[PDB]
Amino acid sequence: VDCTMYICGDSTECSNLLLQYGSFCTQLNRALTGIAVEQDKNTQEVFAQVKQIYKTPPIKDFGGFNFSQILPDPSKPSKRSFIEDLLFNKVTLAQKFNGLTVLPPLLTDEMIAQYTSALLAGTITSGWTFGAGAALQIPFAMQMAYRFNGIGVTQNVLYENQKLIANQFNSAIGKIQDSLSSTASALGKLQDVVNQNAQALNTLVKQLSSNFGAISSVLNDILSRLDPPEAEVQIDRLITGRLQSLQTYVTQQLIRAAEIRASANLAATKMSECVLGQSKRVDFCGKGYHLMSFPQSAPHGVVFLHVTYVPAQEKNFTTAPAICHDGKAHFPREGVFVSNGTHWFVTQRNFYEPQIITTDNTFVSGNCD
Amino acid sequence: LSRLDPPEAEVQIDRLITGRLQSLQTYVTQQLIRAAEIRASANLAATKMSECVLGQSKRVDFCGKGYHLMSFPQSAPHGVVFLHVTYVPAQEKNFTTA
Amino acid sequence: VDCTMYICGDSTECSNLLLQYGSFCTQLNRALTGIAVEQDKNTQEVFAQ
Amino acid sequence: PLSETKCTLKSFTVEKGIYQTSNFRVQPTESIVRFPNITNLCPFGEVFNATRFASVYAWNRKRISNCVADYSVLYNSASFSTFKCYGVSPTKLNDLCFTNVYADSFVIRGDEVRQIAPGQTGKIADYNYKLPDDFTGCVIAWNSNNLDSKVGGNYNYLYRLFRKSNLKPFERDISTEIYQAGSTPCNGVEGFNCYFPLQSYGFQPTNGVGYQPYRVVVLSFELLHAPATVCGPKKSTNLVKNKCVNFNFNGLTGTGVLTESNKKFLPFQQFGRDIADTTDAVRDPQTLEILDITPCSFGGVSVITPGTNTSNQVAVLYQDVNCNVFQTRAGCLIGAEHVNNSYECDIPIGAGICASYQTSQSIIAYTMSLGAENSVAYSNNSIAIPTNFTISVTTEILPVSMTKTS
Amino acid sequence: PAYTNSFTRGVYYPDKVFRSSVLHSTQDLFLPFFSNVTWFHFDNPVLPFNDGVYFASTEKSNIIRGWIFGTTLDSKTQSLLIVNNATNVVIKVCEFQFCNDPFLMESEFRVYSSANNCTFEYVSQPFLMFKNLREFVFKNIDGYFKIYSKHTPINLVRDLPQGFSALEPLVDLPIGINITRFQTLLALHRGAAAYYVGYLQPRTFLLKYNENGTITDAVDCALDPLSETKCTLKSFTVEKGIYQTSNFRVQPTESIVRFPNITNLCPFGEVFN
């Protein structure tokens, strides 16, 4: 807000009534432009946890896993990506005129996607090495296998069921544009946070039809219709409600302002954990056991894509927490024991595969009874 | 109140008294989202306050980048000045599995 | 909180001068009613599990 | 441009990074004037005191258009005393151009000049002359003491005196028997409670100054909805494009560049606005074309800094100013030897463009870098085993409490 | 008597100040949508203003020759005239006598009853030359008089056509005879008529002006609780939800005044008697 032209506009004596008078709209700027640097800083650490582009490899031959929805592609102007094509027409909006201004953001919407294009590469390329530093090689199929050992899934099964994972993963990715190709209200929190600024700008401008005890709502009539060594009183009250409306607008922005950062620090932390590191904390990024994520662009936010390991098709098997054999206990290394009513078996916690009760899978201690 | 008369001072007093406590309005908002910036940094202190400190738990990227040793705490406000010993290995070999 | 019931009451000239301010009334509700959905979504996002 | 936020934080020292400036339009030149061609200046003979402006229940109507409107051609034709303007400025009238203009004469009594106003209450209020509150124009009475004052009482106009109830606002009324207020009706016999509202005047100059008549013009004019050509007398100039100049198209000013369009604008409709309350399409009434006011305010500026005490040479980021320059993607990067190497970031610009002060020497900018992407052993029958130590720690501070308030 | 639905008509500009594509609101007087209307025909009785006139004429007829906006019908409570002389809008403001039923090979001139006390005479371009349909707006508070109309041929000769249309500022007049009642004017040549008179009252509207600055839609702030929400979100289309908009209470009726027990007993009256 350029302050004086919001209050008075192009008038000497209205400004010369505004200068017995310290530093309101000075400090109102230093209020507002003080926040103005910070959203760019909020834009800063919410993506820039890397230090240049990882270039995705030109061959796209990753074990059958399709990825044609999340990379950028030069069909568009070389930078936007495929889900984001569906995105950036689904949030539509003020103007430049009297009183106000709109500075641009620090980074541009073309190059917000530039860091995202970087991030998807390395987490396909090398995985969570590049959260640390230099990044060793990994091929994507065995990393996913190495990824399942975080949540106790015995990592044979990903080698053992490589093909079945593929099309389920692929069609789930195509489902997420299907979840947004028609219409969702779930764009939502993006849509209003632009919209509530617009009405806030609109309720800023709509103030200026006020009379506030004066006989006008324009400036120059007070100059014209009555006498400037008496009608400055008619200016005098007209200042302060406009000063109040500016005072409210700086206020009611400021409450929501760092409320965004308080949301955004949560946003960057999920960008910190759930993009880089295969976390353990449950119910934190998507419903289910966390596997990995893939982030995209947004007009003023970020949209994550998560991936969760969801169990299905349970079959209750008869269990017992202890085996005695020659008077000694037998406790499983992980998982528990099951039986199909007939013979006992050994498996892990979260995927069914029986084995044979061995010396290997167990260890002994203590007496029996 | 003294020089201006309450008929034509009342539109001056209209947004004088009504506007003055709109300026710690400024201040407390400036306070609490530095305070809640630390009231959650309390929790961010609580992230590595005790977990890799009183004893040891086992979360990647919550005991510092590296597999953690222990701590020895000292006094501060907005502080307790840790030395979180996390074991990122530096130099890389191989041994040839079979 | 009503704007008009809190300022005015059994008067009209009260409200007639208030119509000079008229943005200020509906200013306050969207502040306060916004708290109401804010409180509800908190009670949602805690126990909608 | 490095010295532009020392005073924004109001201090004799500036830090390192990237700051902001004042605004960016592109440098303005001129102020064009565009008025339609009507030869006629508006004649003010038979509106302002010519010979006879009759009844308080009958005004001399003339539909006034097809002429150039001006305000300093009144004071000659009558003996004015009172100028009382609403909805409009009293002297910005040749700074404008109206739509569907009127100049509207009548006469008042001298004791009750006061309630000729939008609703002063008393005996001035249910039997004559009535218009809603939303009226834009002036109210003009004048001195006149010669022609409307005879030697035997002025019997030259009626006034209606009685009426029951209230109304909506704007009309006229004939019909004319003996009035009935309450009981004992009239039916054209003039009984009791059947009042005789047509009651003799006493307008004489021997009667006092409060008992004189006052002829009143109330001016009536409106701003730009029908296409009108009534525009004032401050004569015309050329018409320009691709620049931001002052204009005046039929009474709405603005600030913007006139660019061309191709649309089928319905040809009886003067101006327009788009979705977010700004005028998009402007008509000129000479050549019959529609121009689009592209708002000439367009631009943003930045400046890459290390400060004053350290140095005094610049690196520029003219952000939305089109362009030793180079061109990176958060703005036009001058003061900036664009190098081809790659190092860490000190002052970022965007898309991995950062600037710093490296190796007379000038501030340089560049593209940033991840580190050594290499190719170490992939043998199937190998695994990687670290064993050495030279011990120290990896620190962080962590915050416990802070300040309270009252 | 002969009520018909007042569908959509009864609009006008408050004045002509420029605003386009902006949903704007004022506090003025307008036609309540979905109300009755006075369909009157052979017989033309007098009509009181009744705090409302929205006139509408009929088609198939150039027969209507203006109006008798009225008080009492003689020459005693000062006068109007609005006619058409088949070429021009003749406005006398002359004081004509008791033409309670004035009518007109051209038969005319029964309405000319007393040509005395003429104080305004007027000639301009005529108001109107499946036939064009006339509608008008008729009121009084502090000043002038309107002429607001638009004319369109349509079917449905007697009943009101639906569809929404603006009205236009034609002809505006500071005359000076504040109104009790009214009556019409027609003709004959040598009386089977139809017309409508509406009613307006103070009521907030929300107005749509088009992309070009012309009325295309409006709503009412008292017709339903639906448009009440439209009257407070400044928009036509609102979203599925819930909107606190306005408030009510219960009005007082008796307004009692209660005071302590009587007879503190001044002995003032003893010196009088």
From Swiss-Prot, chain C:
Q: Which domain of life is it from?
A: Viruses
The disulfide bonds in this chain are C3-C25, C8-C14
Q: Describe the task this protein carries out.
A: Precursor of the fusion protein processed in the biosynthesis of the S protein and the formation of virus particle. Mediates fusion of the virion and cellular membranes by functioning as a class I viral fusion protein. Contains two viral fusion peptides that are unmasked after cleavage. The S2/S2' cleavage occurs during virus entry at the cell membrane by host TMPRSS2 or during endocytosis by host CSTL.
The protein depicted here goes by the name Spike protein S2
Instruction: Look up and give the organism this protein is from.
Output: Severe acute respiratory syndrome coronavirus 2 (2019-nCoV)
Q: Which gene encodes it?
A: S
Please tell me where this chain falls within the complete protein, as first and last residue plus total length.
736 to 784 of 1273
